[PDB]
């Protein structure tokens, strides 16, 4: 379903974010949180806030 797509999208955000963390990116990783802003409105506030705090 769509929930699976959202899930793999989230783990894609974590994966790519980890890659940017390993490559030492600042503006990219810092702008990632701004880029995922509209994506956080498609799901619950709990997972969104958790993602924000994690990143």
User: How many angstroms is the resolution?
Assistant: 6.8
If phi > 0 it is left, if psi is from -120 to 50 it is alpha, else beta; for residue 43 that is beta
Distance CA 23, CA 9 (A): 21
- DSSP track, the chain: -HHHHHHHHHHHHHHHHHHHHHTT-SHHHHHHHHHSTGGGGSS-HHHHHHHHHH-
């Amino acid at each position: 379903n769509d929930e699976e797509a959202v899930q793999v999208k989230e783990q894609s955000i974590l994966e790519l974010g980890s890659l940017l963390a390993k490559t030492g990116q600042a503006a990219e990783l810092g702008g990632l949180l701004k880029y995922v802003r509209p994506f956080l409105n498609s799901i619950s506030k709990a997972k969104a806030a958790r993602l924000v705090r994690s990143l």
